Amino acid sequence: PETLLFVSTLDGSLHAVSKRTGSIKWTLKEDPVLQVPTHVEEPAFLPDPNDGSLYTLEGLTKLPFTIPELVCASPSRSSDGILYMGKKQDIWYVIDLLTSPSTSLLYLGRTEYTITMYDTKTRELRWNATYFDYAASLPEDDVDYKMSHFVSNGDGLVVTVDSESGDVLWIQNYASPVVAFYVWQREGLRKVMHINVAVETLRYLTFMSGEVGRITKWKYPFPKETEAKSKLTPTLYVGKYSTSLYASPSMVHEGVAVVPRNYWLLIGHHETP
């Protein structure tokens, strides 16, 4: 279990992946990360599955509070008539690493954050969302770890990469876009920081990495965390998932549009607020 690596996706598919191989050992399919039906009626707030932040489209920008932070603080009342009301259930899961059942198993706990906004001025609720998240510790810059992660936004492509050199460990494709990584630490989950990159850009990198790997025939090269950050332009990616609009940070390469109900128009990359 210390060898395995947990991977969380937008459709609620937690995959237990062997870090070295990059393939899936077993998977847990449960409730999906972001479910926002109020955006169907009026889209105003834009959640972020990576941690739980919220953005507002009045133009696109980031808010000071996450959905979890807004749920715990709630109930409250705004200057505007709208009042906030949250709910935060805690579910746990236990399944044998092989699968009074078998002992020394793995106990995983997650959350159901659920925020709701009702405008006092109006006669109807003005927003609503349901955000899940796995309970795990904070990321630290551990020297024991020798990997890093690049994940496409809007597509389930993962590129695992040696921490120091950047040489590709494994590129893999999961059904739904990945949102978070967790490795087993202190008999529990510890979140692993990753780097969101544009799917177009990420695919573009993966091909050239194979091209340089073929021509040189020495090592398939992939950039380090800092190199991409300096080289690639930042962008705020907007996406959709089953009639639910979300936002996230992202990196684009040259030749990609980035902005400074028509769902699709707002979808894509925007300039970092």
Task: Using CB under 8 A, list all residues that contact its own copies.
Answer: 71-72, 74-77, 83-92, 100, 107, 109-111, 120, 123, 135, 187-188
| Integer Cα distance of 215 and 223 in angstroms | 17
User: Of the two residues 18 and 78, which places its CB atom closer to its own copies in the complex?
Assistant: 78
Work out how close the CB of 81 gets to its own copies at its nearest, in angstroms, rounded to a whole number.
Answer: 9
Work out how close the CB of 88 gets to its own copies at its nearest, in angstroms, rounded to a whole number.
Answer: 5
Work out how close the CB of 96 gets to its own copies at its nearest, in angstroms, rounded to a whole number.
Answer: 15
The answer to whether 194 touches 181, Cβ cutoff 8 Å, is yes
| Integer Cα distance of 47 and 58 in angstroms | 16
Kindly state the tokens that stand for 192.
């692993």
User: What is 39-54 written as a DSSP string?
Assistant: HHH---EEE-TTT--E
Determine the residue type at 210.
G
Work out how close the CB of 165 gets to its own copies at its nearest, in angstroms, rounded to a whole number.
Answer: 35
Three-state secondary structure call for residue 143 = coil
Work out how close the CB of 78 gets to its own copies at its nearest, in angstroms, rounded to a whole number.
Answer: 11
User: Of the two residues 188 and 213, which places its CB atom closer to its own copies in the complex?
Assistant: 188
Q: How far is CA 122 from CA 40, 71, 79, 86, in A?
A: 17, 22, 14, 19
Number of H helices, E strands in the chain: 5, 20
Q: Which of 134, 85, 138, 143 is CA-nearest to residue 111?
A: 134
| Integer Cα distance of 222 and 159 in angstroms | 9
The answer to whether 269 touches 256, Cβ cutoff 8 Å, is yes
For residue 129, give the H/E element and its range: strand 125-134
User: Of the two residues 100 and 262, which places its CB atom closer to its own copies in the complex?
Assistant: 100
User: Of the two residues 184 and 204, which places its CB atom closer to its own copies in the complex?
Assistant: 184
User: Of the two residues 78 and 243, which places its CB atom closer to its own copies in the complex?
Assistant: 78
Work out how close the CB of 178 gets to its own copies at its nearest, in angstroms, rounded to a whole number.
Answer: 22
User: Of the two residues 132 and 241, which places its CB atom closer to its own copies in the complex?
Assistant: 132
Work out how close the CB of 51 gets to its own copies at its nearest, in angstroms, rounded to a whole number.
Answer: 16
User: Of the two residues 110 and 269, which places its CB atom closer to its own copies in the complex?
Assistant: 110
